[PDB]
Amino acid sequence: AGDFARLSVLSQALTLYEVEAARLYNAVSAGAGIDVDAAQAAETGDYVQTSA
Amino acid sequence: ESLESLFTKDSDPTVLDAAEQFAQWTLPTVLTRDISGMDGKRTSLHRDYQSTGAVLVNSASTKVTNALFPQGAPFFRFVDSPDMAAAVAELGINGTVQSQQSQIELSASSLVFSRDNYAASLRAVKLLMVTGNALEYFDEGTGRSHIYSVREYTVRRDGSGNILRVVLKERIAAMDLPQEFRSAHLGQKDDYDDVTLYTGICLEDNKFKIYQEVQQQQIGDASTYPIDECPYTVLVWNLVNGEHYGRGLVEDYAGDFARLSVLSQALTLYEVEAARLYNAVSAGAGIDVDAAQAAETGDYVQTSAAPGTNPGIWAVENGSDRKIMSLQSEISMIEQKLARAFMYAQNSLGDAYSILSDHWLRKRAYLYTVYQYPPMRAMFTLGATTIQILVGTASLNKAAQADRLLEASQSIQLVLPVLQGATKRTNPDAVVDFILDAFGVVSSKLMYTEEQLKQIQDQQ
Amino acid sequence: ESLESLFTKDSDPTVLDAAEQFAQWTLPTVLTRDISGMDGKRTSLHRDYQSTGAVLVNSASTKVTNALFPQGAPFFRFVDSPDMAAAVAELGINGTVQSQQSQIELSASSLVFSRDNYAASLRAVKLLMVTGNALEYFDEGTGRSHIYSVREYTVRRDGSGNILRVVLKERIAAMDLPQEFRSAHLGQKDDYDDVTLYTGICLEDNKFKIYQEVQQQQIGDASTYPIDECPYTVLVWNLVNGEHYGRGLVEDYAGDFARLSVLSQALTLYEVEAARLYNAVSAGAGIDVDAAQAAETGDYVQTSAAPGTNPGIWAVENGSDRKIMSLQSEISMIEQKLARAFMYAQNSLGDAYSILSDHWLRKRAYLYTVYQYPPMRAMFTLGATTIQILVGTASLNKAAQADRLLEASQSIQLVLPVLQGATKRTNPDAVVDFILDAFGVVSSKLMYTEEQLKQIQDQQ
């Protein structure tokens, strides 16, 4: 029973960590001066001005 | 008291919702979401983000169907009984009793590979593993088998778990209805007008009464069948005690499938992020963007950056390149576990396989046998309900005894000559009897008895 | 009432759009988008950025066509029955009844390789895999099979799924019409014009009715064929309950194809970005650009940069060099999954293969058998209701009997001499009968009967 309980706890933790790792979100820095409006389209090769 | 009311009362929407979810996980085409009102149009199916489940279910269906109905080998064996021996003679088949039994067996078993029956068996297995519930109706006339999903029929069970009432709902064209019924009631329906045909099965005085109604009016005469001879067969994969409806295979691994779907969606999003391409331009670098944009053929573009470094225009190194390998590795681990669970030999499957090869093949053997040989029906149960069959893996029984006899013969060949040549005190009959008893071989089925041995001792 | 109105009513634009999308993902030439009104001119096919789907579909269709119609061996066999024996004998074929049946099956099966039927069969398989629907017509006069895509015909079904009305829209030359009809209505069209020949199939009194009309004018008589021998044969890959048109195999993996297309477009864009070459020149480096642009021989070019470093003119290495490997790896994973889904042995495919082998082959086997032997039409149509056939993988049923006979013979050879030499109490006939019964082979079919055995004894 103890092995099964440990397996259940570890499986729950692994599921939570998988959910956390599956999260995708982009971070934008205001000080970098990146043209966020032009950069959000992209996907073709467009030239986007940046201050970095 | 109408069949529509009984179908409404016995219906479990939760079972339908769970079956729809499982199908959407594995095979959306197995069970859709109430496409009756679409007037036979192509409904939009929301396929899941991962296709592993479809492959796993297809492989499991093929393997299970092959195991249940092997090709070139009948799936049920008649047991050696005097009652069967007396009844097989009145069948119009020449040869010995063993040959007649083998011929009837092969002819009955080959019916599953005769007319769209193998496809019906495959669809039934697919429904049983995915949905968990299935129902077949063996038409006595043509000999075909039709498989209905849980959406088309309902079952009511007692506390013990026996079948009490089964109601089937199917939409058919008005042509199938008798002309008198259309003339009387459905006078506004054309030939191709689609109407409901409720079929009801009820248990009363240890028999199943089957009758059909259209618009709450019965058609034809209510025929009755016993439990063993009921054309309709209800099938369950895993039946919880006290529950009318069984549980499917994928329900056991629902959480793993959900985790795989979430991981696959995240992987798709990360691949979309990685496929994004754009070049960032730094104004402070001083790169001549108006001339660097053309380039292509390797022109000389002026830049103010330090020599040997980036001119000022560079492809954006997106951060989504990593975490794709980790997501793929986790998805691979989940898929490996599922494949281990989906046998991608009758051991990963628990009682579900045993249930399948104890009731489905048993009544299939009867229906197939009586269809090929109508006289067998009376002698089977109507005359004397004593003939027994061995369906499933239990069919490969007498082959085990043949192998045991071969092993006993090898042991006899190894032992008896030595004891014979050693001395005359040894009894060869005692030695062979001892070997056969040790190997558990029925010597009476392959040795002359005392009666005919004495007959050949005088007539010689 | 006109066939044009029925064709317009039964047509489903959603099915056509889905078929067009699936064809675009796969082989794009299978089903185009309304090129009828362009006078046979070449149309620009917007091919998808992926090229794996075409190869997968080609390989899968070729393998499935090979499986359905194995070369050399017949694709259908006759079951042994006394009704079939009498009918087959009255044809003029010499030899035993089994030899006559084998020759008839071989001759009927060979017709699929005679007149552009294998090509038509493979085209139908491709259409069923991609589009999901196909219509087959066997010209009983010449012996050729024609395949029509879902764009050129419509299907109306009832609730059960039976065929009620089928309307076929095909474009033919004006000369094909009878002279009387041309003089009646189509008197303004010369030989090389286009007319729309509408063919309709209606279910009236369990007998399909076939008649053709052009411009709402019936042409000729209205021949009627029963269900089992209608030359038209509607084929579906995956038939959803209640719907009129089937769904193809490609639909099961539409998301994978869409992801592959997106990733292929991204990879093409990144390849274009990486292929770009342009030189960046730094004004502060002091590089003699005029002298450096010639080079290519070993000339000495003055520069103001530190020795051993970049003079000031360097090829720009952009950031798209990476993320090409990641995109290629993800595309390879998707292609591996698709190839496993497209069986790149009949187990990856679902119940669709079983349905095709049960309906398409049974109908096809009948027509070739009747076409080869015109007298064979009335054999099992007017009478002989017991005449049945085995199609698909179930046709190889007698080979299983031969294998069982081989195994039983080996067992008898191993066992019987040992028991015979052990004692005289054994019964060789009983041992042989027991072994044959255990192995399930029909013993009476391959040995003397009791009546004729006494004839040998009477005649010594």
JSON list of C-alpha atoms in Angstrom, two decimals, chain B residues 29 32 39-43 47 51-52 55 58-59 62 71-72 77 94-96 98-99 101-103 106 110 113-116 118-119 122-123 126 152 171-173 175 192 194 267-268 271 273-277 279 287 292-303 305-311 313-315 320 324-325 328 344 398 402 405-406 409 412 429 432-433 445-448 452-453, chain C residues 10 12 14-15 18 22 158-160 164-165 202-203 238 240-244 247 251-254 256 259 263 266 269-270 273 276-283 289 292-293 310 312-314 316-320 323 329-330 333 337 340 347-348 350-351 354-355 358 362 389-390 393-394 396-397 400-401 404 414-415 418-419 423-428 430-431 433-434 437-444:
[
{"chain": "B", "resi": 29, "resn": "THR", "atom": "CA", "xyz": [-16.02, 8.60, -36.27]},
{"chain": "B", "resi": 32, "resn": "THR", "atom": "CA", "xyz": [-20.57, 11.27, -33.04]},
{"chain": "B", "resi": 39, "resn": "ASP", "atom": "CA", "xyz": [-30.35, 15.29, -42.40]},
{"chain": "B", "resi": 40, "resn": "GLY", "atom": "CA", "xyz": [-27.39, 13.14, -43.39]},
{"chain": "B", "resi": 41, "resn": "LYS", "atom": "CA", "xyz": [-24.86, 15.95, -43.79]},
{"chain": "B", "resi": 42, "resn": "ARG", "atom": "CA", "xyz": [-21.14, 15.96, -43.03]},
{"chain": "B", "resi": 43, "resn": "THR", "atom": "CA", "xyz": [-20.96, 17.11, -39.42]},
{"chain": "B", "resi": 47, "resn": "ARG", "atom": "CA", "xyz": [-10.48, 15.71, -33.77]},
{"chain": "B", "resi": 51, "resn": "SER", "atom": "CA", "xyz": [-3.49, 10.74, -33.16]},
{"chain": "B", "resi": 52, "resn": "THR", "atom": "CA", "xyz": [-1.75, 8.09, -31.04]},
{"chain": "B", "resi": 55, "resn": "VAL", "atom": "CA", "xyz": [-3.57, 3.95, -33.96]},
{"chain": "B", "resi": 58, "resn": "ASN", "atom": "CA", "xyz": [-7.09, 0.26, -34.38]},
{"chain": "B", "resi": 59, "resn": "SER", "atom": "CA", "xyz": [-4.25, -2.12, -33.52]},
{"chain": "B", "resi": 62, "resn": "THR", "atom": "CA", "xyz": [-7.44, -5.87, -35.14]},
{"chain": "B", "resi": 71, "resn": "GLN", "atom": "CA", "xyz": [-8.70, -17.50, -39.74]},
{"chain": "B", "resi": 72, "resn": "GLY", "atom": "CA", "xyz": [-8.63, -21.14, -40.80]},
{"chain": "B", "resi": 77, "resn": "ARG", "atom": "CA", "xyz": [-15.69, -27.18, -30.48]},
{"chain": "B", "resi": 94, "resn": "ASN", "atom": "CA", "xyz": [-21.65, -38.56, -44.82]},
{"chain": "B", "resi": 95, "resn": "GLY", "atom": "CA", "xyz": [-18.62, -40.01, -43.07]},
{"chain": "B", "resi": 96, "resn": "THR", "atom": "CA", "xyz": [-17.83, -40.84, -39.47]},
{"chain": "B", "resi": 98, "resn": "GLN", "atom": "CA", "xyz": [-15.91, -37.01, -36.03]},
{"chain": "B", "resi": 99, "resn": "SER", "atom": "CA", "xyz": [-15.88, -36.04, -39.72]},
{"chain": "B", "resi": 101, "resn": "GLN", "atom": "CA", "xyz": [-18.87, -32.82, -36.47]},
{"chain": "B", "resi": 102, "resn": "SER", "atom": "CA", "xyz": [-15.80, -31.25, -38.10]},
{"chain": "B", "resi": 103, "resn": "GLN", "atom": "CA", "xyz": [-17.77, -30.45, -41.26]},
{"chain": "B", "resi": 106, "resn": "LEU", "atom": "CA", "xyz": [-16.21, -25.58, -40.19]},
{"chain": "B", "resi": 110, "resn": "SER", "atom": "CA", "xyz": [-16.91, -19.91, -41.93]},
{"chain": "B", "resi": 113, "resn": "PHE", "atom": "CA", "xyz": [-16.24, -14.60, -43.23]},
{"chain": "B", "resi": 114, "resn": "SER", "atom": "CA", "xyz": [-19.26, -14.84, -45.55]},
{"chain": "B", "resi": 115, "resn": "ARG", "atom": "CA", "xyz": [-21.23, -11.57, -45.81]},
{"chain": "B", "resi": 116, "resn": "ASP", "atom": "CA", "xyz": [-20.03, -8.38, -44.03]},
{"chain": "B", "resi": 118, "resn": "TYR", "atom": "CA", "xyz": [-16.13, -9.71, -40.11]},
{"chain": "B", "resi": 119, "resn": "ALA", "atom": "CA", "xyz": [-16.64, -5.96, -40.49]},
{"chain": "B", "resi": 122, "resn": "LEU", "atom": "CA", "xyz": [-14.57, -5.42, -35.93]},
{"chain": "B", "resi": 123, "resn": "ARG", "atom": "CA", "xyz": [-17.06, -2.59, -35.40]},
{"chain": "B", "resi": 126, "resn": "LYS", "atom": "CA", "xyz": [-14.23, -1.10, -31.58]},
{"chain": "B", "resi": 152, "resn": "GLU", "atom": "CA", "xyz": [-29.34, 3.60, -30.66]},
{"chain": "B", "resi": 171, "resn": "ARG", "atom": "CA", "xyz": [-34.38, 5.45, -38.23]},
{"chain": "B", "resi": 172, "resn": "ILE", "atom": "CA", "xyz": [-35.47, 3.76, -41.47]},
{"chain": "B", "resi": 173, "resn": "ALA", "atom": "CA", "xyz": [-37.15, 4.80, -44.69]},
{"chain": "B", "resi": 175, "resn": "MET", "atom": "CA", "xyz": [-40.37, 1.68, -47.80]},
{"chain": "B", "resi": 192, "resn": "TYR", "atom": "CA", "xyz": [-37.87, 7.96, -48.93]},
{"chain": "B", "resi": 194, "resn": "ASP", "atom": "CA", "xyz": [-37.30, 8.54, -42.79]},
{"chain": "B", "resi": 267, "resn": "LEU", "atom": "CA", "xyz": [3.73, 20.95, -28.45]},
{"chain": "B", "resi": 268, "resn": "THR", "atom": "CA", "xyz": [1.64, 22.27, -31.34]},
{"chain": "B", "resi": 271, "resn": "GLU", "atom": "CA", "xyz": [5.99, 24.39, -32.93]},
{"chain": "B", "resi": 273, "resn": "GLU", "atom": "CA", "xyz": [6.03, 29.67, -32.05]},
{"chain": "B", "resi": 274, "resn": "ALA", "atom": "CA", "xyz": [9.25, 28.15, -33.42]},
{"chain": "B", "resi": 275, "resn": "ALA", "atom": "CA", "xyz": [8.07, 28.38, -37.04]},
{"chain": "B", "resi": 276, "resn": "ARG", "atom": "CA", "xyz": [7.80, 32.16, -36.64]},
{"chain": "B", "resi": 277, "resn": "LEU", "atom": "CA", "xyz": [10.54, 33.96, -38.58]},
{"chain": "B", "resi": 279, "resn": "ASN", "atom": "CA", "xyz": [14.51, 39.78, -38.59]},
{"chain": "B", "resi": 287, "resn": "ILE", "atom": "CA", "xyz": [23.37, 48.67, -40.88]},
{"chain": "B", "resi": 292, "resn": "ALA", "atom": "CA", "xyz": [20.80, 44.78, -46.79]},
{"chain": "B", "resi": 293, "resn": "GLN", "atom": "CA", "xyz": [17.18, 43.82, -47.49]},
{"chain": "B", "resi": 294, "resn": "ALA", "atom": "CA", "xyz": [17.93, 43.02, -51.14]},
{"chain": "B", "resi": 295, "resn": "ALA", "atom": "CA", "xyz": [21.32, 41.28, -50.77]},
{"chain": "B", "resi": 296, "resn": "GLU", "atom": "CA", "xyz": [20.67, 37.74, -52.07]},
{"chain": "B", "resi": 297, "resn": "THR", "atom": "CA", "xyz": [23.56, 37.65, -54.56]},
{"chain": "B", "resi": 298, "resn": "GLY", "atom": "CA", "xyz": [26.12, 38.77, -51.97]},
{"chain": "B", "resi": 299, "resn": "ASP", "atom": "CA", "xyz": [26.43, 42.54, -52.31]},
{"chain": "B", "resi": 300, "resn": "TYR", "atom": "CA", "xyz": [28.65, 44.88, -50.29]},
{"chain": "B", "resi": 301, "resn": "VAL", "atom": "CA", "xyz": [26.41, 46.54, -47.69]},
{"chain": "B", "resi": 302, "resn": "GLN", "atom": "CA", "xyz": [27.86, 49.24, -45.46]},
{"chain": "B", "resi": 303, "resn": "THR", "atom": "CA", "xyz": [27.49, 48.75, -41.71]},
{"chain": "B", "resi": 305, "resn": "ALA", "atom": "CA", "xyz": [29.20, 47.68, -36.46]},
{"chain": "B", "resi": 306, "resn": "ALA", "atom": "CA", "xyz": [32.56, 46.34, -35.37]},
{"chain": "B", "resi": 307, "resn": "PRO", "atom": "CA", "xyz": [34.17, 44.01, -37.95]},
{"chain": "B", "resi": 308, "resn": "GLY", "atom": "CA", "xyz": [33.50, 40.31, -37.48]},
{"chain": "B", "resi": 309, "resn": "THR", "atom": "CA", "xyz": [30.30, 40.84, -35.48]},
{"chain": "B", "resi": 310, "resn": "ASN", "atom": "CA", "xyz": [26.63, 40.98, -36.45]},
{"chain": "B", "resi": 311, "resn": "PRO", "atom": "CA", "xyz": [25.94, 43.79, -38.97]},
{"chain": "B", "resi": 313, "resn": "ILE", "atom": "CA", "xyz": [20.13, 42.59, -38.79]},
{"chain": "B", "resi": 314, "resn": "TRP", "atom": "CA", "xyz": [19.79, 39.07, -37.41]},
{"chain": "B", "resi": 315, "resn": "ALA", "atom": "CA", "xyz": [17.18, 36.33, -37.40]},
{"chain": "B", "resi": 320, "resn": "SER", "atom": "CA", "xyz": [10.83, 28.04, -28.05]},
{"chain": "B", "resi": 324, "resn": "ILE", "atom": "CA", "xyz": [10.21, 20.99, -27.57]},
{"chain": "B", "resi": 325, "resn": "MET", "atom": "CA", "xyz": [12.61, 18.12, -26.89]},
{"chain": "B", "resi": 328, "resn": "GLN", "atom": "CA", "xyz": [8.44, 15.25, -27.12]},
{"chain": "B", "resi": 344, "resn": "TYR", "atom": "CA", "xyz": [1.01, -2.38, -29.36]},
{"chain": "B", "resi": 398, "resn": "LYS", "atom": "CA", "xyz": [-8.31, -31.73, -28.19]},
{"chain": "B", "resi": 402, "resn": "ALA", "atom": "CA", "xyz": [-3.13, -34.95, -29.30]},
{"chain": "B", "resi": 405, "resn": "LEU", "atom": "CA", "xyz": [-0.55, -38.51, -26.81]},
{"chain": "B", "resi": 406, "resn": "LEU", "atom": "CA", "xyz": [2.46, -37.70, -28.99]},
{"chain": "B", "resi": 409, "resn": "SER", "atom": "CA", "xyz": [4.22, -42.21, -27.57]},
{"chain": "B", "resi": 412, "resn": "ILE", "atom": "CA", "xyz": [6.87, -45.32, -24.80]},
{"chain": "B", "resi": 429, "resn": "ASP", "atom": "CA", "xyz": [0.73, -53.87, -21.50]},
{"chain": "B", "resi": 432, "resn": "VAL", "atom": "CA", "xyz": [2.11, -48.76, -21.80]},
{"chain": "B", "resi": 433, "resn": "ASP", "atom": "CA", "xyz": [-0.88, -48.44, -19.47]},
{"chain": "B", "resi": 445, "resn": "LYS", "atom": "CA", "xyz": [-10.50, -44.00, -27.38]},
{"chain": "B", "resi": 446, "resn": "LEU", "atom": "CA", "xyz": [-7.53, -45.47, -29.28]},
{"chain": "B", "resi": 447, "resn": "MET", "atom": "CA", "xyz": [-7.26, -49.14, -28.21]},
{"chain": "B", "resi": 448, "resn": "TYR", "atom": "CA", "xyz": [-9.33, -52.23, -28.94]},
{"chain": "B", "resi": 452, "resn": "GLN", "atom": "CA", "xyz": [-13.67, -57.06, -30.24]},
{"chain": "B", "resi": 453, "resn": "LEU", "atom": "CA", "xyz": [-10.23, -58.36, -29.25]},
{"chain": "C", "resi": 10, "resn": "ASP", "atom": "CA", "xyz": [-29.25, 15.68, -52.64]},
{"chain": "C", "resi": 12, "resn": "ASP", "atom": "CA", "xyz": [-24.06, 18.50, -50.02]},
{"chain": "C", "resi": 14, "resn": "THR", "atom": "CA", "xyz": [-19.94, 20.65, -47.15]},
{"chain": "C", "resi": 15, "resn": "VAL", "atom": "CA", "xyz": [-18.90, 17.16, -48.26]},
{"chain": "C", "resi": 18, "resn": "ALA", "atom": "CA", "xyz": [-14.11, 18.70, -47.13]},
{"chain": "C", "resi": 22, "resn": "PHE", "atom": "CA", "xyz": [-8.43, 16.49, -48.10]},
{"chain": "C", "resi": 158, "resn": "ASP", "atom": "CA", "xyz": [-32.71, 6.31, -44.86]},
{"chain": "C", "resi": 159, "resn": "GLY", "atom": "CA", "xyz": [-32.22, 6.07, -41.11]},
{"chain": "C", "resi": 160, "resn": "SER", "atom": "CA", "xyz": [-30.89, 2.51, -41.25]},
{"chain": "C", "resi": 164, "resn": "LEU", "atom": "CA", "xyz": [-32.82, 4.91, -51.69]},
{"chain": "C", "resi": 165, "resn": "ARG", "atom": "CA", "xyz": [-31.95, 7.34, -54.51]},
{"chain": "C", "resi": 202, "resn": "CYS", "atom": "CA", "xyz": [-34.67, 4.79, -57.48]},
{"chain": "C", "resi": 203, "resn": "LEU", "atom": "CA", "xyz": [-35.74, 2.12, -55.00]},
{"chain": "C", "resi": 238, "resn": "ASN", "atom": "CA", "xyz": [-16.38, 5.19, -43.00]},
{"chain": "C", "resi": 240, "resn": "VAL", "atom": "CA", "xyz": [-21.46, 7.63, -39.99]},
{"chain": "C", "resi": 241, "resn": "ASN", "atom": "CA", "xyz": [-24.85, 6.41, -38.79]},
{"chain": "C", "resi": 242, "resn": "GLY", "atom": "CA", "xyz": [-27.57, 8.58, -40.31]},
{"chain": "C", "resi": 243, "resn": "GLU", "atom": "CA", "xyz": [-25.36, 10.33, -42.85]},
{"chain": "C", "resi": 244, "resn": "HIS", "atom": "CA", "xyz": [-25.50, 9.93, -46.63]},
{"chain": "C", "resi": 247, "resn": "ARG", "atom": "CA", "xyz": [-15.72, 9.77, -44.57]},
{"chain": "C", "resi": 251, "resn": "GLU", "atom": "CA", "xyz": [-10.06, 12.87, -42.15]},
{"chain": "C", "resi": 252, "resn": "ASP", "atom": "CA", "xyz": [-8.88, 10.74, -39.21]},
{"chain": "C", "resi": 253, "resn": "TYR", "atom": "CA", "xyz": [-5.55, 12.62, -39.32]},
{"chain": "C", "resi": 254, "resn": "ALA", "atom": "CA", "xyz": [-6.51, 16.09, -40.54]},
{"chain": "C", "resi": 256, "resn": "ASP", "atom": "CA", "xyz": [-1.51, 16.13, -38.28]},
{"chain": "C", "resi": 259, "resn": "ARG", "atom": "CA", "xyz": [0.44, 20.89, -38.56]},
{"chain": "C", "resi": 263, "resn": "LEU", "atom": "CA", "xyz": [5.64, 23.53, -40.35]},
{"chain": "C", "resi": 266, "resn": "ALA", "atom": "CA", "xyz": [7.70, 27.82, -41.90]},
{"chain": "C", "resi": 269, "resn": "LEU", "atom": "CA", "xyz": [10.41, 30.54, -45.26]},
{"chain": "C", "resi": 270, "resn": "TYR", "atom": "CA", "xyz": [13.42, 29.81, -43.04]},
{"chain": "C", "resi": 273, "resn": "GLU", "atom": "CA", "xyz": [15.91, 33.47, -45.21]},
{"chain": "C", "resi": 276, "resn": "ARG", "atom": "CA", "xyz": [20.03, 35.08, -48.48]},
{"chain": "C", "resi": 277, "resn": "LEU", "atom": "CA", "xyz": [23.60, 36.29, -49.01]},
{"chain": "C", "resi": 278, "resn": "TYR", "atom": "CA", "xyz": [24.71, 39.89, -48.61]},
{"chain": "C", "resi": 279, "resn": "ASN", "atom": "CA", "xyz": [27.97, 41.49, -47.51]},
{"chain": "C", "resi": 280, "resn": "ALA", "atom": "CA", "xyz": [28.15, 44.10, -44.75]},
{"chain": "C", "resi": 281, "resn": "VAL", "atom": "CA", "xyz": [30.80, 46.83, -44.94]},
{"chain": "C", "resi": 282, "resn": "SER", "atom": "CA", "xyz": [31.83, 48.88, -41.90]},
{"chain": "C", "resi": 283, "resn": "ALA", "atom": "CA", "xyz": [32.84, 52.47, -42.61]},
{"chain": "C", "resi": 289, "resn": "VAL", "atom": "CA", "xyz": [36.13, 48.29, -50.30]},
{"chain": "C", "resi": 292, "resn": "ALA", "atom": "CA", "xyz": [38.50, 44.29, -51.67]},
{"chain": "C", "resi": 293, "resn": "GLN", "atom": "CA", "xyz": [35.51, 43.79, -53.98]},
{"chain": "C", "resi": 310, "resn": "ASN", "atom": "CA", "xyz": [37.95, 40.76, -39.79]},
{"chain": "C", "resi": 312, "resn": "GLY", "atom": "CA", "xyz": [35.60, 45.08, -42.24]},
{"chain": "C", "resi": 313, "resn": "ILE", "atom": "CA", "xyz": [33.75, 43.17, -44.97]},
{"chain": "C", "resi": 314, "resn": "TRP", "atom": "CA", "xyz": [32.13, 39.97, -43.73]},
{"chain": "C", "resi": 316, "resn": "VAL", "atom": "CA", "xyz": [26.27, 38.24, -42.60]},
{"chain": "C", "resi": 317, "resn": "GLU", "atom": "CA", "xyz": [25.44, 35.10, -40.61]},
{"chain": "C", "resi": 318, "resn": "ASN", "atom": "CA", "xyz": [21.77, 35.49, -39.73]},
{"chain": "C", "resi": 319, "resn": "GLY", "atom": "CA", "xyz": [19.99, 33.74, -36.87]},
{"chain": "C", "resi": 320, "resn": "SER", "atom": "CA", "xyz": [17.83, 31.46, -39.03]},
{"chain": "C", "resi": 323, "resn": "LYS", "atom": "CA", "xyz": [15.61, 26.34, -35.76]},
{"chain": "C", "resi": 329, "resn": "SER", "atom": "CA", "xyz": [13.02, 17.10, -36.35]},
{"chain": "C", "resi": 330, "resn": "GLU", "atom": "CA", "xyz": [9.41, 17.98, -35.54]},
{"chain": "C", "resi": 333, "resn": "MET", "atom": "CA", "xyz": [8.27, 13.08, -35.90]},
{"chain": "C", "resi": 337, "resn": "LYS", "atom": "CA", "xyz": [3.40, 9.23, -36.82]},
{"chain": "C", "resi": 340, "resn": "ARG", "atom": "CA", "xyz": [2.65, 4.49, -38.78]},
{"chain": "C", "resi": 347, "resn": "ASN", "atom": "CA", "xyz": [-4.65, -3.53, -38.75]},
{"chain": "C", "resi": 348, "resn": "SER", "atom": "CA", "xyz": [-3.81, 0.17, -39.03]},
{"chain": "C", "resi": 350, "resn": "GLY", "atom": "CA", "xyz": [-10.14, 0.27, -39.19]},
{"chain": "C", "resi": 351, "resn": "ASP", "atom": "CA", "xyz": [-13.40, -1.46, -40.09]},
{"chain": "C", "resi": 354, "resn": "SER", "atom": "CA", "xyz": [-13.63, -5.13, -43.73]},
{"chain": "C", "resi": 355, "resn": "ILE", "atom": "CA", "xyz": [-16.60, -3.24, -45.17]},
{"chain": "C", "resi": 358, "resn": "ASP", "atom": "CA", "xyz": [-17.54, -7.60, -47.78]},
{"chain": "C", "resi": 362, "resn": "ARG", "atom": "CA", "xyz": [-19.13, -9.58, -53.22]},
{"chain": "C", "resi": 389, "resn": "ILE", "atom": "CA", "xyz": [-19.34, -17.00, -51.80]},
{"chain": "C", "resi": 390, "resn": "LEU", "atom": "CA", "xyz": [-16.34, -16.16, -49.62]},
{"chain": "C", "resi": 393, "resn": "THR", "atom": "CA", "xyz": [-9.25, -12.82, -46.60]},
{"chain": "C", "resi": 394, "resn": "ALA", "atom": "CA", "xyz": [-12.07, -15.27, -45.80]},
{"chain": "C", "resi": 396, "resn": "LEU", "atom": "CA", "xyz": [-8.49, -18.51, -48.16]},
{"chain": "C", "resi": 397, "resn": "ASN", "atom": "CA", "xyz": [-10.49, -20.89, -45.96]},
{"chain": "C", "resi": 400, "resn": "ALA", "atom": "CA", "xyz": [-6.61, -23.64, -43.63]},
{"chain": "C", "resi": 401, "resn": "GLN", "atom": "CA", "xyz": [-8.30, -27.03, -44.02]},
{"chain": "C", "resi": 404, "resn": "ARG", "atom": "CA", "xyz": [-5.04, -28.79, -40.58]},
{"chain": "C", "resi": 414, "resn": "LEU", "atom": "CA", "xyz": [4.17, -39.84, -35.27]},
{"chain": "C", "resi": 415, "resn": "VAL", "atom": "CA", "xyz": [1.58, -41.58, -33.06]},
{"chain": "C", "resi": 418, "resn": "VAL", "atom": "CA", "xyz": [4.05, -46.59, -31.67]},
{"chain": "C", "resi": 419, "resn": "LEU", "atom": "CA", "xyz": [0.61, -47.59, -30.41]},
{"chain": "C", "resi": 423, "resn": "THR", "atom": "CA", "xyz": [-0.03, -53.90, -28.29]},
{"chain": "C", "resi": 424, "resn": "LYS", "atom": "CA", "xyz": [-2.73, -55.46, -30.45]},
{"chain": "C", "resi": 425, "resn": "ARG", "atom": "CA", "xyz": [-5.43, -53.91, -28.23]},
{"chain": "C", "resi": 426, "resn": "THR", "atom": "CA", "xyz": [-5.26, -50.60, -30.13]},
{"chain": "C", "resi": 427, "resn": "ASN", "atom": "CA", "xyz": [-7.69, -49.74, -32.92]},
{"chain": "C", "resi": 428, "resn": "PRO", "atom": "CA", "xyz": [-5.95, -47.93, -35.81]},
{"chain": "C", "resi": 430, "resn": "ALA", "atom": "CA", "xyz": [-10.29, -45.34, -33.85]},
{"chain": "C", "resi": 431, "resn": "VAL", "atom": "CA", "xyz": [-6.92, -43.61, -33.39]},
{"chain": "C", "resi": 433, "resn": "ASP", "atom": "CA", "xyz": [-10.72, -40.89, -36.26]},
{"chain": "C", "resi": 434, "resn": "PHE", "atom": "CA", "xyz": [-9.86, -39.47, -32.83]},
{"chain": "C", "resi": 437, "resn": "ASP", "atom": "CA", "xyz": [-11.79, -35.15, -34.85]},
{"chain": "C", "resi": 438, "resn": "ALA", "atom": "CA", "xyz": [-9.37, -33.43, -32.45]},
{"chain": "C", "resi": 439, "resn": "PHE", "atom": "CA", "xyz": [-7.85, -31.48, -35.34]},
{"chain": "C", "resi": 440, "resn": "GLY", "atom": "CA", "xyz": [-11.34, -30.69, -36.66]},
{"chain": "C", "resi": 441, "resn": "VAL", "atom": "CA", "xyz": [-10.81, -31.92, -40.22]},
{"chain": "C", "resi": 442, "resn": "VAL", "atom": "CA", "xyz": [-13.83, -33.37, -42.03]},
{"chain": "C", "resi": 443, "resn": "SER", "atom": "CA", "xyz": [-12.82, -37.04, -42.18]},
{"chain": "C", "resi": 444, "resn": "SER", "atom": "CA", "xyz": [-15.76, -38.32, -44.25]}
]
